[PDB]
Design an enzyme around this catalytic site. Structure first.
Site, PDB file in Angstrom:
ATOM      1  N   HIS A  21      39.715  44.744  33.441  1.00 42.03           N
ATOM      2  CA  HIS A  21      40.266  45.971  34.042  1.00 42.03           C
ATOM      3  C   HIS A  21      39.138  46.969  34.294  1.00 42.03           C
ATOM      4  O   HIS A  21      39.045  48.012  33.641  1.00 42.03           O
ATOM      5  CB  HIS A  21      41.374  46.554  33.177  1.00 42.03           C
ATOM      6  CG  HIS A  21      42.672  45.822  33.324  1.00 42.03           C
ATOM      7  ND1 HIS A  21      42.822  44.493  32.987  1.00 42.03           N
ATOM      8  CD2 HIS A  21      43.875  46.228  33.800  1.00 42.03           C
ATOM      9  CE1 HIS A  21      44.065  44.115  33.236  1.00 42.03           C
ATOM     10  NE2 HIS A  21      44.726  45.151  33.724  1.00 42.03           N
TER      11      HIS A  21
ATOM     12  N   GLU B  67      44.732  40.465  41.333  1.00 43.08           N
ATOM     13  CA  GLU B  67      45.770  41.272  41.994  1.00 43.08           C
ATOM     14  C   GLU B  67      45.209  42.148  43.110  1.00 43.08           C
ATOM     15  O   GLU B  67      45.640  43.285  43.313  1.00 43.08           O
ATOM     16  CB  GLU B  67      46.569  42.100  40.983  1.00 43.08           C
ATOM     17  CG  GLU B  67      47.273  41.209  39.968  1.00 43.08           C
ATOM     18  CD  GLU B  67      47.902  41.944  38.796  1.00 43.08           C
ATOM     19  OE1 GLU B  67      48.029  43.189  38.823  1.00 43.08           O
ATOM     20  OE2 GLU B  67      48.264  41.248  37.807  1.00 43.08           O
TER      21      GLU B  67
ATOM     22  N   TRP C  22      47.141  48.876  43.464  1.00 42.90           N
ATOM     23  CA  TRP C  22      46.925  49.674  42.255  1.00 42.90           C
ATOM     24  C   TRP C  22      45.456  49.706  41.791  1.00 42.90           C
ATOM     25  O   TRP C  22      44.923  50.790  41.539  1.00 42.90           O
ATOM     26  CB  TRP C  22      47.904  49.268  41.142  1.00 42.90           C
ATOM     27  CG  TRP C  22      48.105  47.793  40.975  1.00 42.90           C
ATOM     28  CD1 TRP C  22      47.425  46.969  40.117  1.00 42.90           C
ATOM     29  CD2 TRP C  22      49.056  46.968  41.658  1.00 42.90           C
ATOM     30  NE1 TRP C  22      47.888  45.682  40.229  1.00 42.90           N
ATOM     31  CE2 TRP C  22      48.891  45.653  41.162  1.00 42.90           C
ATOM     32  CE3 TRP C  22      50.043  47.211  42.627  1.00 42.90           C
ATOM     33  CZ2 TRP C  22      49.659  44.585  41.610  1.00 42.90           C
ATOM     34  CZ3 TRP C  22      50.810  46.144  43.074  1.00 42.90           C
ATOM     35  CH2 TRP C  22      50.610  44.841  42.567  1.00 42.90           C
TER      36      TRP C  22
ATOM     37  N   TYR D 202      55.174  38.832  37.926  1.00 39.37           N
ATOM     38  CA  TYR D 202      56.109  39.567  37.080  1.00 39.37           C
ATOM     39  C   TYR D 202      57.417  39.624  37.835  1.00 39.37           C
ATOM     40  O   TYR D 202      57.467  40.087  38.960  1.00 39.37           O
ATOM     41  CB  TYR D 202      55.579  40.963  36.736  1.00 39.37           C
ATOM     42  CG  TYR D 202      54.404  40.883  35.794  1.00 39.37           C
ATOM     43  CD1 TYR D 202      54.584  40.953  34.410  1.00 39.37           C
ATOM     44  CD2 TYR D 202      53.112  40.664  36.283  1.00 39.37           C
ATOM     45  CE1 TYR D 202      53.498  40.838  33.535  1.00 39.37           C
ATOM     46  CE2 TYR D 202      52.019  40.548  35.413  1.00 39.37           C
ATOM     47  CZ  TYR D 202      52.225  40.637  34.047  1.00 39.37           C
ATOM     48  OH  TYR D 202      51.174  40.522  33.170  1.00 39.37           O
TER      49      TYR D 202
ATOM     50  N   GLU E 246      49.060  35.140  35.263  1.00 44.60           N
ATOM     51  CA  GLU E 246      49.769  36.123  34.421  1.00 44.60           C
ATOM     52  C   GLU E 246      51.240  35.913  34.657  1.00 44.60           C
ATOM     53  O   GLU E 246      51.669  35.615  35.780  1.00 44.60           O
ATOM     54  CB  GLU E 246      49.479  37.566  34.799  1.00 44.60           C
ATOM     55  CG  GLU E 246      48.130  38.029  34.424  1.00 44.60           C
ATOM     56  CD  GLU E 246      47.952  39.554  34.462  1.00 44.60           C
ATOM     57  OE1 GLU E 246      48.922  40.337  34.367  1.00 44.60           O
ATOM     58  OE2 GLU E 246      46.810  39.979  34.589  1.00 44.60           O
TER      59      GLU E 246
ATOM     60  N   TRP F  21      51.879  37.640  29.266  1.00 45.57           N
ATOM     61  CA  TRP F  21      51.260  38.847  28.728  1.00 45.57           C
ATOM     62  C   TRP F  21      51.762  39.130  27.302  1.00 45.57           C
ATOM     63  O   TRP F  21      52.596  38.399  26.768  1.00 45.57           O
ATOM     64  CB  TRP F  21      51.478  40.028  29.673  1.00 45.57           C
ATOM     65  CG  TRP F  21      50.291  40.951  29.798  1.00 45.57           C
ATOM     66  CD1 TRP F  21      50.227  42.277  29.434  1.00 45.57           C
ATOM     67  CD2 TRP F  21      48.997  40.620  30.334  1.00 45.57           C
ATOM     68  NE1 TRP F  21      48.975  42.779  29.710  1.00 45.57           N
ATOM     69  CE2 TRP F  21      48.208  41.794  30.275  1.00 45.57           C
ATOM     70  CE3 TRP F  21      48.431  39.447  30.858  1.00 45.57           C
ATOM     71  CZ2 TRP F  21      46.882  41.831  30.721  1.00 45.57           C
ATOM     72  CZ3 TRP F  21      47.097  39.488  31.288  1.00 45.57           C
ATOM     73  CH2 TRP F  21      46.349  40.678  31.224  1.00 45.57           C
ATOM     74  N   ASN F  22      51.201  40.149  26.665  1.00 41.02           N
ATOM     75  CA  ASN F  22      51.563  40.483  25.283  1.00 41.02           C
ATOM     76  C   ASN F  22      52.632  41.576  25.243  1.00 41.02           C
ATOM     77  O   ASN F  22      53.329  41.795  26.240  1.00 41.02           O
ATOM     78  CB  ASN F  22      50.313  40.859  24.467  1.00 41.02           C
ATOM     79  CG  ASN F  22      49.615  42.108  24.984  1.00 41.02           C
ATOM     80  OD1 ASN F  22      49.898  42.606  26.075  1.00 41.02           O
ATOM     81  ND2 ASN F  22      48.687  42.624  24.191  1.00 41.02           N
TER      82      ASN F  22
END
Length: 336
Positions: free
Chosen positions: A105, A167, A172, A242, A266, A298-299
């Site tokens: 990130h 991504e 974003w 997602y 992911e 993911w967590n």
């Protein structure tokens, strides 16, 4: 057919793992590696996620992820956003029968620090690509610290699923598009340049020979293949997905068509609703996405451990868990 890493100087262990991964869909069982994100280095990274999955299912994820870059932090030097202390656990994960994965990130080098989700113009992006500008120097300072961390893993011969600049078809992260599903031909070109700049920094400048390169567009935005930097820079293609509906994920056909192994790089619920079911995700893989070689859930609230269907996911005949890569001193079968 042998599948070799794109890096011509890849370490033998990395070559072996890459060929093994690529052949998984030829099997009748044990053909999709499980995976979980462990967190951000010296922030949220720990073994807790792996341990919770094991407590819930009796099995551990084959792949364990860390992210070196806490790109939201406002710091004195931009590279302070990078922490590599998760390395020990990643090396141990390999030793003990899994495979590590690293994402980033990245803080935004158009700024003094932080600003990872602040969009930038093409003129700013061009400066980042130019090693002679303040922006380019900030980028290189981050890359240097990242490479120092990666070298630690290379010294023990540990293969790493390296997934930078993910991504990018989303709007974003600073390295991606600037408006929702808005094609920008110049941005697409600049992204490819940035990916290649990182590839060359890690591979050539830094000689990192244990990396398996992962290209991971978002499933919920257009242009999944437009950002592809080329066959010589990517080992694995995949989707960050997602969703609520496991069967409606867009992009599998487009990405598998690139003739690279495919993964769900992911995965998690789009919303915390108590509706999400990981058993449906593995079923969708079997019916809709059979070339999938791994998933990385993911967590936190996205975790397999706290969502329905964890046991069914981890015990499915297709799912390959920690300890199932090697059979003691031998490799589990490569099926042609």
């Amino acid at each position: 057919h042998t599948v070799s890493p794109v890096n011509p100087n890849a370490q033998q262990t990395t070559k072996t793992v890459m060929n093994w991964l690529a052949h998984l869909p030829n099997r009748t069982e044990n053909r999709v590696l499980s995976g979980a994100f462990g967190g951000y280095s010296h922030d949220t990274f720990s073994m807790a996620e792996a341990d919770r999955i094991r407590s819930a299912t009796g099995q551990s994820p084959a792949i364990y992820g860390c992210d070196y870059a806490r790109g939201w932090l406002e710091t004195a030097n931009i590279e302070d956003s990078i922490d590599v202390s998760c390395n020990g656990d990643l090396m141990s994960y390999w030793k003990n029968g899994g495979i590590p994965q690293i994402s980033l990130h990245l803080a935004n080098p158009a700024f003094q620090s932080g600003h990872f989700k602040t969009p930038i113009t093409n003129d700013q992006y061009k400066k980042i690509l130019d090693s002679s500008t303040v922006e380019g120097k900030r980028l290189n300072a981050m890359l240097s610290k990242i490479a120092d961390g990666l070298q630690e893993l290379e010294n023990q011969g540990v293969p790493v699923l390296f997934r930078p600049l993910h991504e990018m078809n989303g709007e974003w992260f600073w390295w991606g598009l600037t408006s929702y599903n808005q094609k920008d031909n110049e941005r697409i070109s600049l992204y490819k340049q940035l990916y290649k700049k990182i590839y060359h920094y890690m591979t050539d400048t830094r000689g990192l020979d244990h990396l398996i390169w992962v290209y991971s567009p978002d499933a919920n935005r257009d242009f999944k293949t437009d950002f592809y930097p080329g066959a010589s820079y990517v080992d694995i293609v995949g989707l960050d997905a997602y969703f609520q509906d496991a069967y409606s994920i867009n992009g599998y056909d487009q990405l598998t068509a690139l003739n690279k192994p495919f993964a769900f790089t992911e995965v998690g619920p789009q919303t915390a609703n108590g509706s999400f079911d990981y058993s449906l995700f593995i079923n969708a893989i079997k019916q809709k996405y059979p070339k999938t070689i791994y998933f990385l859930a993911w967590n936190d609230e996205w975790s397999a451990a706290v969502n329905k269907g964890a046991s069914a996911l981890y015990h499915d005949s297709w799912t390959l868990n920690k300890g199932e890569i090697w059979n003691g001193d031998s490799l589990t079968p490569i099926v042609e």
